[PDB]
């Protein structure tokens, strides 16, 4: 009970730091998916060309 | 008898504050997965576009 | 003889203690590998979306 | 024998959950590949198209 | 001889029973294997589409 | 009776001071694992960047 | 009381310097990863030409 | 000499038994590496699939 | 020596074992690659109508 | 001097008796790398066919 | 406090050689992907042809 | 009184040769974990190219 | 002070041992490395003919 | 020194041998990739008659 | 002195005792990592082959 109280607290805190960290791999990607898609766009117009 | 139930009261406490810890356990990696699936879905758009 | 025998019984009585905070553990123990199978099984999906 | 027991039942349950994030599973794929197969099907109206 | 005689039977019961958590921990496998063969059987399918 | 009672609560006192030491290990511990999530969460960009 | 105050400050010390190497670890990793970042995007970039 | 002898051959004996129980210990990690070939083994079927 | 020689045997039953869910992995993927075949060619007679 | 060399000797016997274990790992692992092989050439199959 | 700073600096002279290795994994995959660049480019002329 | 005085002080001495024991500790622990870092690394290369 | 002096010695002794040992692990990965370039290098081909 | 000498060759021995297996995995991967060139260029000439 | 004498001597002869079991221990060690490296390197192939 009373040990592992500060315990779980400290657990929370963790979970919400993960949270951050998840939020920025979800940009990252935002980032990269944002690259494939104009680049993908590129070829696109190639095939247009052709 | 008399020694060991003392005990065993403490042990039945110990193994739920287990459970507690463990469910906190499940959550942390609700958000990891959950990082994992959204991330991944960022690929398969790439893909959408490739 | 005579005076072993009070202390035989008192080892049988020692041993079923014993015997009870065993079944303590494996129950504990029921919970951790609980926690192991359902969190490996959230892993699972990350793969399956990978 | 005795001690077992328990454990073994306990095992059958943590099985059978087992079983259940396992038909989670198969479902989250469903969408992904319902989505994979109608996002094809897109391309192969470009296809047509050309 | 004597002494050793009722723990070598001991063991003999411990090592059967570790065969039976030993076929539970087959089975197990046999889902999580099974849940992996029918998912990567669905990215199979968006082979195919694709 | 009345030579055990000095030392029932010392004993009191000592076991309570453990409690506190074990405080501080749960804290010490919930750094080391504070930095195992986080450094585990670095990893898991390295996976969606791949 | 008095023989465990100078321990649980000792303890306290030792903590804030798990920390430091902790923090450390934090920047390792943030080496590592961001090499992890680079070098795949090398490969994206590779794809982008293909 | 004399007092030793009876000794000499009782130590003997209990070698022996001693070399019984050894192979009992051999036995029993057979059935557990089995169960670790085997489920390795399915695994290894995992990756075929994937 | 022999101590180990019935530990020898059972690592050859082991192996045996190994080389039984060795030919079923064989097979199962006999299955995959049928299928990957078949629908390959599909998109074979695709392209002689284009 | 006198007591040591039984030990050296018992010791070198252990030695040879770990070298033939360790000959059935290589033995068990040349199975299931011959497994990897082929399963991997039936993917490779898979490709051609693609 | 005095045992650690040692510790420390011989972490920020490990990390620093990280860095270098680091850096040379950059150039690596620079010549990679320089061979990628090129050998597309053919395909690209390939192309052009076609 | 006047009789652990001599001893305290011996106490102080031997405390800090454990010091200086533990400083060399700390430095054996700094070329392993260096190696660990570099080898690492080159496991990374192995990744950058795959 | 004087009895810890020698201890010093041979523990300097031991950590440049270890230095040793340390060197040919980063040699032995060297060409583990080395072998990863190349083989991952003959894929690359398979990817300039494909 | 003494001790680490029969060391360090039998290191010597064992990476050399690594060398060996290194050199066998460089001509599988040839097979495989020569296998690879070939079939790409029955592809090739698919496409001469398209 | 006197006494002591023909102890330290015995002493000098025990720690060379203790000298050649460390040597055997080395070679031991040296026939199992010899295992680990090759085996490890069965893996390599496979993932040449993957």
Same mark, same amino acid.
């Given at each position: 009970?009373?040990?592992?109280?500060?315990?779980?607290?400290?657990?929370?805190?963790?979970?919400?730091?993960?949270?951050?960290?998840?939020?920025?791999?979800?940009?990252?990607?935002?980032? $990269?998916?944002?690259?494939? $898609?104009? $680049?993908?766009?590129?070829?696109?117009?190639?095939?247009?060309?052709?």
């Amino acid at each position: 009970a009373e040990g592992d109280d500060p315990a779980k607290a400290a657990f929370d805190s963790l979970q919400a730091s993960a949270t951050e960290y998840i939020g920025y791999a979800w940009a990252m990607v935002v980032v $990269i998916v944002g690259a494939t $898609i104009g $680049i993908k766009l590129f070829k696109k117009f190639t095939s247009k060309a052709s």
